[PDB]
Design a protein around this ligand. Structure first.
Ligand SMILES: [Mg+2]
Ligand SMILES: [Mg+2]
Ligand SMILES: [Mg+2]
Ligand SMILES: [Mg+2]
Ligand SMILES: [Mg+2]
Ligand SMILES: [Mg+2]
Ligand SMILES: [Mg+2]
Ligand SMILES: [Mg+2]
Ligand SMILES: [Mg+2]
Ligand SMILES: [Mg+2]
Ligand SMILES: [Mg+2]
Ligand SMILES: [Mg+2]
Ligand SMILES: [Mg+2]
Ligand SMILES: [Mg+2]
Ligand SMILES: [Mg+2]
Ligand SMILES: [Mg+2]
Ligand SMILES: [Mg+2]
Ligand SMILES: [Mg+2]
Ligand SMILES: [Mg+2]
Ligand SMILES: [Mg+2]
Ligand SMILES: [Mg+2]
Ligand SMILES: [Mg+2]
Ligand SMILES: [Mg+2]
Ligand SMILES: [Mg+2]
Ligand SMILES: [Mg+2]
Ligand SMILES: [Mg+2]
Ligand SMILES: [Mg+2]
Ligand SMILES: [Mg+2]
Lengths: 123, 258, 144, 187
RNA sequence: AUCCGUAACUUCGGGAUAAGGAUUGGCUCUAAGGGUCGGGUACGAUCAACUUAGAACUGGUACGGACAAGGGGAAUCUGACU
RNA sequence: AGAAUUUGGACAAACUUGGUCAUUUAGAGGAACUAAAAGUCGUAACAAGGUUUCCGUAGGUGAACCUGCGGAAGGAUCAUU
RNA sequence: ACCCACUCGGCACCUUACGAGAAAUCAAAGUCUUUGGGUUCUGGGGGGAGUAUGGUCGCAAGGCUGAAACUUAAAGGAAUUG
RNA sequence: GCGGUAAUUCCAGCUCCAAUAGCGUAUAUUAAAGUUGUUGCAGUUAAAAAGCUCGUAGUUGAACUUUGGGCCCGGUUGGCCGGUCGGAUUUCCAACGGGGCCUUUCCUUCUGGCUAACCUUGAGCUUGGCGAACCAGGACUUUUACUUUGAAAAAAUUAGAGUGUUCAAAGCAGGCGUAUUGCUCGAAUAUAUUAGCAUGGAAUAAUAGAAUAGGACG
RNA sequence: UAUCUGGUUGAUCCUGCCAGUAGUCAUAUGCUUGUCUCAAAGAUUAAGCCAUGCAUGUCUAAGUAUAAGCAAUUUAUACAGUGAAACUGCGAAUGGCUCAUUAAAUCAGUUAUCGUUUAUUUGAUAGUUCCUUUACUACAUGGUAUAACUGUGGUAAUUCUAGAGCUAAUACAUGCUUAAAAUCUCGACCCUUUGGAAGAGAUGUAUUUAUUAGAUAAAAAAUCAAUGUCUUCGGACUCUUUGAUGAUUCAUAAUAACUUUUCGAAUCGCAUGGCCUUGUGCUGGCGAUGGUUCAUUCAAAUUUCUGCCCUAUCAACUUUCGAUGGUAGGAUAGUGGCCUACCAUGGUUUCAACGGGUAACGGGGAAUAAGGGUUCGAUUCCGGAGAGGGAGCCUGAGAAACGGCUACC
């Protein structure tokens, strides 16, 4: 007896295993950003799905609703902090419309690549 | 089963103690005392978790066993003495005096006070009865029996006790316009100046309350504790003064001062 | 009711500790104890002036009303000082988002203060256990 | 042992309840005393909370109250003449609450003669003053005065001897007395 | 004799006392079950029945104490039955 | 004060004997179903399938099936002012 | 008794499809993914199977109620050209 | 479905593909499954409308009773102005929601006090109207369903705010100074059916009332 | 992240299933396996059986110490450091394990106890007890065992124990000492009529019974039955005492007695001080332990309302000897057919009773979910139940206890 540790999984496998379009897009992302796994892309899609679910649950509400204001401003702030969302886009619809690449461009790997220092994402 | 329970598992302790769900399988079970178990700070938690004057239970026992700390003027060399609302905890070393009093979030606050204010506490009378030989007595929320009171002291009133003798110095009656402290429920910690009460002969008197910001709410009379008139209270109030800022305003202030 | 020849039992029926001294003698047929049961229920004239005893009556007897106040309709008057009321209610089923009629049957003790017929609406109050199944007492009738 | 529970015998519908919860002591019951007369023999029972309970067997005397006069006296119990629940307790002279019994009446005769003066059946100035002030209060009743001829007063046990150890009671008066006399002398 | 309990099958009427079990004495009591008279234009008095049920107590656990008084069950052949 | 022993009572394990319910299970032989198999006998249905099919019921026949009574068109007729 | 016009209520019929439908076809089989007028009954791949067993009705014939094992990838509807 | 002497399907080699420190198989369960159908199935022919009618547990059940118009008060949004240096006021056109009053509208009151807001007016802030706006206690008092609000619904879990576990799963920590003596923000919030409790509304749907007047007022 | 694809045909559109597809704090198994953090784990079948070893004991300044134990006090000649053993007191009823039983039962939430017990805490709270109570008494304090210990032994053996000799207590077990005053009774005697008395006894708390008070929305008059407190005896009359609950026969108090008679300190440490008529004189502090009642807390027991899976090839069930109810009693900590006596004939049921099944402990919750939902929930928290099966019971506040006894299998 002791309080259990909480745990969650951070990725979701897609329903259709063999879809050539999705496979091509996934491998293009992996080659552009230096990844060893489709699990990384699945993880980013999982995070983005959670964010989008939250934004939909808020947008169904009324504006000036305190829950909407609080949680939406918090989400927007938390994304603007990591730069996944520009300070031009702070209306909670661009949140829904973001991308996977917007998250994937903020990884320290590609950020190193941008800030010199590596001249390749694998390096 | 078969008798009283002597253990208390974590995740069954009250949440307002703020005990880590980790850091053990058990929690301190408050000993039998003047306060209910679900309403009790006890001293181990007060000294280790809130004040950080100790890092273990061994150190708390060490502190208590050299008689530095006293509750309501008495020493209480017990690790699980249930200290509760309005209890006065005096540490002659450090020359400190605390009054157990709720913050607005629903937890107990580290409310330091002066020695002249630690010479008294407030008590909510629960029943006025006739004892043996015709002696009337009042019972408070801390199990204090006080004989020969003023005949006008009725139930749901508040009483000023001198804490050296167990004598009464003054009393506040329950009436509209009186300042209340909420002790129990969702509105726990608020302070809001009664406007009127609702009777319901048969069960559970209710009472309406309105904060300084004119925010109204409703509670049961068992969760209410008059502490003076509007304006002047009879005690020192903690920071916030029972206003219950919304989460938005809370973050606004936390950003105003950062 | 029917007034049922008050001293029909083998023991003498009296209110406990209600003593009518034979030395002094006045009117007031017999010192009769009654109480206001509370909660705005009127103590009936039949109970104040009657001669029945009813240990379990909430006006002249040693029981109290505390807890729930229920309401029902009488479907049986065949027991002695005991009836059965039907409590009809509607139970919600969330899957179908609509209700179904449900009923409970509640046995309750009825004082001779009241004469109840099948069909009468009554309101009853929770008392201590009166029998294996009875925990409620009639305290007002709401029909004729 | 004896169980005082309800998870045995059937529900109100008529259903037989399954065996739940082996017998518990907080629902215990114990054997009756069946209190008889003569030669005091009281055994103590240790009950829940400590709380001694005095189980009377073979009890002889009792404190019996005369309420019209406002007194109580200790007397011997002669025998049981009526019980409303069972005639076998009468046959066995078994004492229980609500038992009608006969008692000695001599302390009551003595008290009446020393308090009112006159007599029952058939000196100093202080005493005559007492007895004259306590006049128009000594014409009690016909039936009790007739009982005093035999010195066997009908009383009702008001105590629970198997619970407290006492056979206390009150002398019958008025309509209670008429009721029990009609129940007795009828034949 | 009283109480309990009674299957297959069946022409639904039976089978059936199915099968299979308990009790039964003596004594002292208790309860219930009735008739005839009575009331200005609820009951009281009186008289007499063997029927049932029950409780104590009692005995060398005996008691339909002699007499009296069915053995039963599962199946077949055969004739319907009296 | 008080042990052994002991009267009666309630609580009552356990055993025996019956009864009852359920679940598994054997069984001569009998009667079906399913499949397999290039088996035997025919050819009942699909066309007007060579007597138009089918329903209900009853009888009969190696087997499909046949026949009688009534019904249906899912008919081979939407049709004779 | 006929004719004309009208009307209520019926048995039906012709034409069209706004609509419906897998289609054959349908003034209801329409007003149904723009999904809710009220209400009862029945079905959930094909066989085994309306079988076995148990009840209940019936003189019987049989009726009503009614499985499982096991087996199987198709059975089936409406249309199309041969 | 492949395999019967040219196997893209078997046994292997080569190459290739998918997930990858994980991948496969079995069983069960969820979605897919609108193949359980309240949302939301089907019923002429594909499985399925009882042979037909009547009828008791149930389900469902026509319309109707205060509408309309006015006068005020003060809230939330807006809007020039920005009279502040991308923050706000107040006098403003309008919309949005509340309360009160009058239109035949008692929209329960009996006894009393604060008499309240008071014809109370003392010369421009004073000596004296009507009971709830503050309480007491009472006469009583149609019954439900429904919905709003609130309390209540242990903690953990769930969603979710903040925050260095080096990221993350997590955890409820931690952060800031002259770090010599110390200061300080937190540990939120929401959900939590049905039943019960109180509360506002009073449409919708039921229920009752004065008809051989033992009816209301007084 | 509201997605579908292959298979009936010569081909088409359908109905319809089969197959595929994704997930599983859902198990197993196969192959493979380098690192960091976190971490479940004999539940499923056998609540089947268990070798061995551990899991409940425990002390301070402050109950009892001549250890023939260790020390050294050296303040000690009664003890007065530490301290095994044993007595006493507390605890062992918590915890932990499991899910066999259990389908209105458990359980959830919501109620109640004006229906009761409650060790411990916490706070208040006994001047009343010498019994012919004027020698009856120890109250600067009374008595008896007994353990450990010494020694003699029994048995193969057990946490077995006998006989003999000592000795203690907060053990057992008795038992005194503290006001005054008022009120009631009896009442000698004086004696009067207006009638008064000395003296004796009782008066705590607890138990049992009977009785009484525990009240009241408002205002005045008539006379008497007797005058009532004081009289300017016309009659001035007031003062008069009454708490709480929605509600009580409540709290509480008062009379009469009752009890085999409860409690009311024969206890302990530290400090040792003040007043004198200098006696081992009188007073006196901080604590510990114990104790009656009340309240409080930790609980417990019972309890209101509503809510649980499949099954009609279970439709009638309950009621002999308890089913439903009434009166009374017994029992209980208390309510109550909980049990008994007498009496009545009730109670549940197509709104699914009763019976059967569950590969059923219940919830909080988990998986998967556009929405609605389906399935799971032995398992970290809450409640319940059990200790191989049954039953019974001692001790205690608390157990129908099982790392406690008794019996049967
Ligand atoms: Mg336990
Ligand atoms: Mg503790
Ligand atoms: Mg043909
Ligand atoms: Mg026509
Ligand atoms: Mg026609
Ligand atoms: Mg299907
Ligand atoms: Mg089928
Ligand atoms: Mg292949
Ligand atoms: Mg190959
Ligand atoms: Mg779906
Ligand atoms: Mg379908
Ligand atoms: Mg067909
Ligand atoms: Mg068909
Ligand atoms: Mg038809
Ligand atoms: Mg209707
Ligand atoms: Mg409701
Ligand atoms: Mg086909
Ligand atoms: Mg083909
Ligand atoms: Mg599949
Ligand atoms: Mg105490
Ligand atoms: Mg009773
Ligand atoms: Mg009874
Ligand atoms: Mg089970
Ligand atoms: Mg299991
Ligand atoms: Mg147990
Ligand atoms: Mg075992
Ligand atoms: Mg046991
Ligand atoms: Mg064990």
């Amino acid at each position: 007896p002791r309080a259990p540790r909480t745990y969650s999984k951070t990725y979701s496998t897609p329903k259709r295993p063999y879809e050539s379009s999705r496979l091509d897009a996934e491998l293009k992302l992996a080659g552009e950003f230096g990844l060893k796994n489709k699990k990384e892309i699945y993880r980013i899609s999982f995070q983005l799905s959670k964010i989008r679910r939250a934004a939909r649950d808020l947008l169904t509400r009324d504006e000036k609703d305190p829950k909407r204001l609080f949680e939406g401003n918090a989400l927007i702030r938390r994304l603007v902090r990591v730069g996944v969302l520009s300070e031009d886009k702070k209306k909670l619809d661009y949140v829904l419309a973001l991308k996977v690449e917007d998250f994937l461009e903020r990884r320290l790997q590609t950020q190193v690549y941008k800030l010199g220092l590596a001249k390749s994402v694998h390096h | 089963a078969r008798g009283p329970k002597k253990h208390l598992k974590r995740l069954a302790a009250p949440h307002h103690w703020l005990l880590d769900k980790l850091s053990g399988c058990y929690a301190p079970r408050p000993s039998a005392g003047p306060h209910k178990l679900r309403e009790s700070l006890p001293l181990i938690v007060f000294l280790r978790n809130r004040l950080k004057y100790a890092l273990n239970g061994r150190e708390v026992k060490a502190i208590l066993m050299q008689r530095h700390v006293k509750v309501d003027g008495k020493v209480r060399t017990d690790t699980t003495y249930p200290a509760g609302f309005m209890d006065v905890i005096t540490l002659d070393a450090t020359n400190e005096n605390f009054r157990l009093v709720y913050d607005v979030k629903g937890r107990f606050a580290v409310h330091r006070i002066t020695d002249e204010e630690a010479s008294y506490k407030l008590g909510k009378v629960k029943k006025v009865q006739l004892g043996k030989k015709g002696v009337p007595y009042v019972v408070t929320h801390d199990g204090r029996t006080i004989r020969y009171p003023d005949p006008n002291i009725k139930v749901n009133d508040t009483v000023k006790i001198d804490l050296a003798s167990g004598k009464i110095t003054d009393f506040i009656k329950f009436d509209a316009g009186k300042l209340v402290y909420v002790t129990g429920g969702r509105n726990l910690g608020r302070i809001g100046t009664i406007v009127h009460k609702e009777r319901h002969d048969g069960g559970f008197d209710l009472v309406h309350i309105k904060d300084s910001l004119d925010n109204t709410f409703v509670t049961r009379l068992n969760n209410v504790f008059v502490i003076g008139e509007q304006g002047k209270p009879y005690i020192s109030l903690p920071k916030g003064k029972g206003i219950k800022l919304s989460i938005a305003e809370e973050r606004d202030r936390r950003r105003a001062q950062q | 009711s029917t007034e049922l020849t008050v001293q029909s039992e083998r023991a003498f029926q009296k209110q406990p500790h209600i003593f009518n001294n034979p030395k002094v003698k006045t009117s007031k047929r017999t010192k009769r104890w009654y109480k206001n049961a509370g909660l705005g229920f009127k103590t009936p004239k039949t109970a104040i002036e009657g001669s029945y005893i009813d240990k379990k009556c909430p006006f002249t007897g040693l029981v109290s009303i505390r807890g729930k106040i229920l309401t029902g309709t009488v479907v049986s008057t065949k027991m002695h000082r005991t009836i059965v009321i039907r409590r009809a209610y509607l139970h919600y089923i969330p899957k179908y988002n609509r209700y179904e009629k449900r009923h409970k049957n509640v046995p309750v003790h009825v004082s001779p203060a009241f004469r109840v017929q099948v069909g009468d609406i009554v309101t009853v109050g929770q008392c201590r256990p009166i029998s294996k199944t009875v925990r409620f007492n009639v305290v007002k009738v709401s029909a004729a | 042992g004896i169980s005082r529970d309800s998870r045995h015998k059937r529900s109100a519908t008529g259903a037989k309840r399954a065996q739940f919860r082996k017998k518990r002591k907080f629902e215990l019951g114990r054997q009756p005393a069946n209190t008889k007369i003569g030669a005091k023999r009281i055994h103590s029972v240790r009950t829940r909370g400590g709380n001694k309970k005095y189980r009377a067997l073979r009890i002889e005397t009792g404190n019996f109250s005369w309420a019209s006069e406002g007194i109580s006296k200790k007397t011997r119990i002669a025998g049981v003449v009526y019980h409303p629940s069972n005639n076998e307790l009468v046959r066995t002279n078994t004492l229980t609450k609500a038992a009608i019994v006969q008692i000695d009446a001599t302390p009551f005769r003595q008290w009446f003669e020393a308090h009112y003066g006159q007599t029952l059946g058939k000196k100093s100035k202080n005493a005559e003053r007492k007895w004259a002030a306590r006049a128009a209060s000594a014409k009690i009743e016909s039936s009790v005065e007739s009982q005093f001829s035999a010195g066997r007063l009908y009383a009702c046990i008001s105590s629970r001897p198997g619970q407290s150890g006492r056979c206390d009671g009150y002398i019958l008066e008025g309509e209670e007395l008429a009721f029990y006399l009609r129940r007795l002398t009828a034949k």
